[PDB]
Write an enzyme that holds these catalytic residues in place. Structure first.
Site, short mmCIF file in Angstrom:
data_model
loop_
_atom_site.label_atom_id
_atom_site.label_comp_id
_atom_site.label_asym_id
_atom_site.label_seq_id
_atom_site.Cartn_x
_atom_site.Cartn_y
_atom_site.Cartn_z
CD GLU A 1 25.14 46.93 30.85
OE1 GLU A 1 26.19 46.43 30.37
OE2 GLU A 1 25.14 47.64 31.88
CB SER B 1 27.45 47.98 36.50
OG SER B 1 27.43 47.01 35.46
CE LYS C 1 24.06 47.19 34.93
NZ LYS C 1 24.76 45.88 35.14
CE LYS D 1 25.08 47.95 39.91
NZ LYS D 1 26.37 47.19 39.96
CB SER D 2 30.85 47.36 42.01
OG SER D 2 30.03 46.26 41.66
N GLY D 3 31.19 48.62 39.34
CA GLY D 3 31.15 48.51 37.90
C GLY D 3 32.44 47.88 37.44
CB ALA D 4 33.68 45.12 36.13
CB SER E 1 25.82 44.13 38.40
OG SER E 1 26.28 45.25 37.66
B1 LIG Z 1 28.69 46.24 35.32
O1 LIG Z 1 29.86 47.09 34.96
O2 LIG Z 1 29.00 45.49 36.58
C1 LIG Z 1 28.31 45.25 34.13
N1 LIG Z 1 29.57 44.53 34.02
C2 LIG Z 1 29.82 43.56 33.15
O3 LIG Z 1 29.02 43.14 32.31
C3 LIG Z 1 31.23 42.99 33.27
C4 LIG Z 1 31.62 42.27 34.47
O4 LIG Z 1 30.73 42.09 35.52
C5 LIG Z 1 29.65 41.12 35.45
C6 LIG Z 1 30.04 39.82 34.71
C7 LIG Z 1 32.95 41.73 34.59
C8 LIG Z 1 33.90 41.90 33.53
C9 LIG Z 1 33.53 42.60 32.34
C10 LIG Z 1 32.18 43.16 32.20
C11 LIG Z 1 31.83 43.87 30.99
C12 LIG Z 1 32.80 44.02 29.94
C13 LIG Z 1 34.11 43.47 30.08
C14 LIG Z 1 34.47 42.77 31.29
K LIG Z 2 24.70 47.35 46.17
#
Ligand SMILES: *[B]([O])([O])[C][N]C(=O)C1=C(O[C][C])[C]=[C]C2=C1[C]=[C][C]=[C]2
Ligand SMILES: [K+]
EC number: 3.5.2.6
Length: 263
Positions: free
Chosen positions: A141, A45, A48, A209-212, A105
């Site tokens: 996404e 993320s 973004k 801005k964080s990401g996961a 996000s």
């Molecule tokens: B961004 O990287 O924050 C969008 N992230 C995701 O869709 C995501 C999250 O965060 C929001 C629910 C948590 C765990 C994940 C994600 C995407 C793929 C696998 C695991």
């Molecule tokens: K922010």
């Protein structure tokens, strides 16, 4: 400060994975500390912010309007769309979509915005055109968060991302109004509390801005500084860990505490 690299290396140990890190002086652009600065990591993320940068760039050129309303439907809704799933009938303006994308996000918001600028191809063109030939967005996404090992799709390097963020925030690419709008969106947050913000003293400024993603991928980009004024840019990425989200959050926050301690 080298003590911060001690913490970054400790994070790699605790998480059993690679951690990329870079700290840049916001004013001068000088690199202060780095770890795996040129290794690729999934942006997740954090892209973004680059996305809304591109959007604002079109606004500056009169090719877009922040107040323009975007209508979408259930067909457009993807995993984790907290804000957009709520406004299906109302639609949302470009401004509201960037707010949702950066503060919450929201993934569908990102996809809608990507469409307005031409998709991943055009975001990559935008970056390439501003001098960043490393960062690249390839998918939409939710697939762009796949984080397949060794895959270069949807990746950046700590160094590439840090400099590009610096260019967007203090370069002459965007007008002052847009530069501030971007900073304003980054200052708002409802999802990055467990990261750098948890180590930050109340009076400090932070726009982030964080990401996961999958495979333990986690990251954060930020402009931060004491007493309400940002003075450095920090970028931290990690991928490959089997650790829990809380564990990954804690390590990134600890890197933040060390950064703050030795400021
Ligand atoms: B961004 O990287 O924050 C969008 N992230 C995701 O869709 C995501 C999250 O965060 C929001 C629910 C948590 C765990 C994940 C994600 C995407 C793929 C696998 C695991
Ligand atoms: K922010």
């Amino acid at each position: 400060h080298p003590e911060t690299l001690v913490k970054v290396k400790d994070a790699e140990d605790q998480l059993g994975a690679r951690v990329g890190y870079i700290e840049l002086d916001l004013n001068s652009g000088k690199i202060l500390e780095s770890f795996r600065p040129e290794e690729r990591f999934p942006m997740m993320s954090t892209f973004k912010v680059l996305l809304c940068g591109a959007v604002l760039s079109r606004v500056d050129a009169g090719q877009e309007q922040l107040g323009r309303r975007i209508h979408y439907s259930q067909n457009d809704l993807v995993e984790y769309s907290p804000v957009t799933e709520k406004h299906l009938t109302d639609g949302m303006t470009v401004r509201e979509l960037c707010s949702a994308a950066i503060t919450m996000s929201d993934n569908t918001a990102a996809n809608l915005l990507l469409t307005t600028i031409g998709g991943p191809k055009e975001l990559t063109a935008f970056l390439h055109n501003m001098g960043d030939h490393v960062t690249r967005l390839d998918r939409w996404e939710p697939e762009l968060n796949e984080a397949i090992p060794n895959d270069e799709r949807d990746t950046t390097t700590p160094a590439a991302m840090a400099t590009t963020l610096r260019k967007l925030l203090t370069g002459e690419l965007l007008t002052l109004a847009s530069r501030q709008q971007l900073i304003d969106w980054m200052e708002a947050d409802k999802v990055a509390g467990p990261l750098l913000r948890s180590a930050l003293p109340a009076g400090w400024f932070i726009a982030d801005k964080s990401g996961a993603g999958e495979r333990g991928s986690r990251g954060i980009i930020a402009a931060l500084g004491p007493d309400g004024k940002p003075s450095r840019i920090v970028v931290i990425y990690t991928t490959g860990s089997q650790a829990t989200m809380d564990e990954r959050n804690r390590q990134i926050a600890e890197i933040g505490a060390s950064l703050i301690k030795h400021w």
